[model samples]
Target: DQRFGDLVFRQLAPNVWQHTSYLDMPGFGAVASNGLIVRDGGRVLVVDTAWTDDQTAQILNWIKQEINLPVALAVVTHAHQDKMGGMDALHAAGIATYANALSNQLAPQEGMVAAQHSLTFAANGWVEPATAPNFGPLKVFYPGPGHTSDNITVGIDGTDIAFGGCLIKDSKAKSLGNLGDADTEHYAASARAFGAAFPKASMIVMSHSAPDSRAAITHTARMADKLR
Candidate 1:
């Protein structure tokens, strides 16, 4: 079930599903990104695109085969290439794509630059798909900045699950990934904002690792809090 290349579905709840994919691209740093696919009856919501065109296509194909439903919405947690490179793929499939206002405004500038640089090195091409208005089921909040200026999180009040984006990491990670795009001063504030918004989310899911108890989020927040 944990096959690296294709879509691997995990049950987030009785009905909600999370799909992940692995990319073996050279120098990309991470090997994969776990995408979220939430299905309530015939409606499906894709969280983010993993890495490349092929990976995104495979995930969409699996959705058609397994759920047999059109993707009602696709949400990009941020504007990073690894998280949103496949927007064009989802759009071509007629799915509505969403992102935070900050990401939507700046994604093209930053993401486009990165995509071009990667392609220059034969990494991957940037296909910028038009995006729809920012929206979601959960209460969306952008506290400050950590992963990027557009760093954001979502609180599914009913499910008591918080999609913390790249703000919080698995406790086991030696350290946070990259702060080059972060405003370190506000990282702790961002984590606190998530905790405050979804204090009831006993479970926290990051874009990188499997789910963890809220304690993990607290611990990570404490680490960020300790930062100057």
Candidate 2:
């Protein structure tokens, strides 16, 4: 088994784990970035990564020694550093990393590393409500614009787990944390539509907060409404 310094992984459900790392942000002070480790048979899929490459390597080591599953794929929810900062690490390990098409375009412009693979939701541009793509047992959905134009959500089929990434906020969040790339006018509508699409998603995982029930999405929608 591998030991991580400050990174901690806790099981959220069967074969699904949430890993979190804390770091100091410019204005947010000490903040956390969360990711997921999902075991599907003998294959493992990672969602997002730690804030730095070192911490991300620790996660890979833990997966190697503890989980003993071959890394299948890694999906970045958006272009934010907290979401895709470890792209270099994943790439160095020869692991395939994926993000939506828009994230692929915007991340580099933001000076953040881009994923190796780009997923397309629509032929033209953003989908009005959402677009659900079939990927094995995982349901990848692009629910328009919210936290970022490229933000996407992933759901475990036949389960209540939904990784909302940075789109969903924490329980105690007063407002949308960072609006640097947020679509304030369309944020609330996008969030509500995503929640409606996955009503059975009882466990909602956010990028920088503790996992909560579907109320997390509602809370985000409420916050976005105020912004609108």
Candidate 3:
């Protein structure tokens, strides 16, 4: 079983896994958050984190005991606690962390720590070549503003996997979930931009829900369309 503490891991593809962790909000009980861990070559890249430092540590332990490969990099998708909750743990474990420059600055304001390095951007505000060199065939893109201003989507190049963080909701999601930090005005644009950016992605990993197909991007945009 790839279950560790409050985290559960499922295979999305060969050498690719998506993990979910829980957070017990006062009224919401246990809310889940999802992230991706992908092994490429001799190293692995982690996208997002568990809901807390301890849970994040558990993920690292799972990766160590299971994957047996050093985590070469970790990219936090946004400033939300669910996205960077284990950021402190990652830094403690000597894992190089990267995020959008805006996330690095906005994280502290939300009581979350930022990544160590700021991601390199191309002329279009996306990682150069549409696939970042440090990210290992993944395109780290910050699509204007959506669920959060600093949220970025990491899509595997030429693969069917993309980590939507909390920006793209799952197909079965009943509501938009939390809107406390949402950007209603541009949420649809951001969602659509993600669809346009990762047109090949079928497996879209989401926070608080299981991985869904590319239609989840359109689903999210349609849901946000009501906000405008």
Best by lDDT: 3
Which stretches of model 1 miss by more than 4 angstroms? 2-5, 25-30, 112-136
Instruction: List the global CA lDDT of all models.
Output: 0.67, 0.82, 0.84
Question: How many clashes in each candidate?
Answer: 0, 0, 0
Report the C-alpha lDDT of model 2 over 68-91, residue by residue, as the tens digit.
998888888898888888888898
lDDT assessment of candidate 2: 0.82
Per-model TM values vs. the true structure: 0.82, 0.91, 0.94
Clashes of 2: 0
Q: Quick one: RMSD of model 3?
A: 1.8
Error of 1 at 185 (Å): 0.1
- lDDT: which is higher, 2 or 3? 3
The best candidate in terms of TM-score: 3
- Which residue runs of candidate 2 sit more than 4 Å off their true CA positions? 1-3, 26-28, 122-134
**Candidate 1: count of backbone clashes, pairs at least 3 residues apart or interchain:** 0
Itemize residue pairs with steric clashes in candidate 2.
none
How well is each residue in 1-228 modelled by candidate 3, as lDDT tens digits? 379888899888887888888889898798878888889889988989888999999999999998899999898888988888889899999998888888888988889888888875665558754334466766788777888888888888757887778888988877788888889999998999888888778788888788788888898999999999
Q: Please give the lDDT score at residue 142 for candidate 3.
A: 77
